[PDB]
């Protein structure tokens, strides 16, 4: 984040000290500077690594979900009057890759909700401004089965009531991990199968645990239905704040295939170029 070191002038050298020659077998990166191999002038460095900080790298709102809801009528079976979305950053790739640069992370989160609505037909009248309810459902809490069941009382569940046309809604969340850091990767299982029990029992998905269980968001339109159908989409933008990260990893090189590290397609990411072609 802070200023880089200056460059010191270097003249000709004739000595038994050989910074150029090293041994990478040790696993240590040679900390050479230009003045070690070539003659250098004095440069008072003014560049800084301020935008390379882990905070800056993640200080952007990244779309992570597009939740679709409808306001048509209870009778219509093809219209989804409410939508439940499991909270995760793995429905999108860009933030997922930036995060999976690191094994562990710990950060507060900022959720911004951009709601856009539209008509689906013209010859059924018009609609009044809609209010959307976004109810956070932590794991274990009752999940709505209908758009107007008791669960939406939100006596305890945090809930956001957004008026259409208002600026995108926004909330902040502290670090809510049950562990001391978020696990981008979990090399293990939630169950250990025990000798004796049937192959059906004890079988758990690889890499899946309750560390990444954060509940879901239930989104509905609070208004009663107008004689015409209205389709709305809530876009969720996640911004990490106060980011700490641990154990850097090589970034994803091939397309993601599911919530894990599985790959199936695009296994040839590199193009063809001659060895002696510039």
């Amino acid at each position: 984040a802070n200023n880089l070191p200056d460059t010191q002038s270097s003249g000709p050298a004739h000595s038994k000290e050989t910074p150029a020659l090293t041994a990478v077998e040790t696993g240590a990166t040679n900390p050479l500077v230009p003045s070690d191999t070539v003659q250098t002038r004095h440069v008072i460095q003014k560049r800084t690594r301020s935008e390379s900080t882990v905070e800056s790298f993640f200080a952007r709102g990244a779309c992570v979900a597009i939740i679709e809801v409808d306001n048509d009528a209870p009778t219509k079976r093809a219209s989804k009057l409410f939508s439940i979305w499991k909270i995760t950053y793995k429905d999108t790739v860009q933030l997922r890759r930036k995060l999976e640069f690191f094994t562990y992370s710990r950060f507060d989160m900022e959720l911004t909700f951009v709601v856009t609505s539209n008509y689906t037909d013209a010859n059924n009248g018009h609609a009044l401004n809609q209010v959307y309810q976004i109810m956070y459902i932590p794991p274990g809490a009752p999940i709505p089965g209908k758009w107007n069941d008791y669960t939406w009382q939100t006596s305890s569940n945090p809930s956001l009531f957004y008026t259409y046309g208002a600026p995108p809604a926004r909330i902040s969340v502290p670090y809510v991990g049950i562990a001391n850091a978020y696990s981008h990767f979990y090399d293990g299982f939630a169950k250990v199968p025990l000798a004796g029990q049937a192959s059906t029992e004890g079988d758990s998905l690889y890499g899946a645990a309750s560390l990444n269980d954060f509940g879901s968001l239930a989104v509905r339109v609070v208004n009663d239905h107008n004689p015409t159908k209205l389709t709305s989409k809530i876009r969720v933008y996640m911004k990490p704040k106060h980011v700490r990260v641990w154990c850097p990893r090589p970034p994803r090189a091939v397309p993601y295939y599911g919530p894990g590290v599985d790959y199936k397609d695009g296994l040839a990411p590199l193009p063809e170029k001659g060895l002696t072609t510039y």
């Binding site: 050298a13 038994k16 050989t18």
Partner: peptide, 22 residues
């Protein structure tokens, strides 16, 4: 001892290891 005296102007007339980086 011996004595020497010059009798002329012009003095011509007087009597007679392995690792290295460059």
């Amino acid at each position: 001892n011996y004595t020497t005296i010059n009798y002329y102007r012009d003095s011509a007339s007087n009597a007679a290891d392995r690792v290295m980086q460059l």
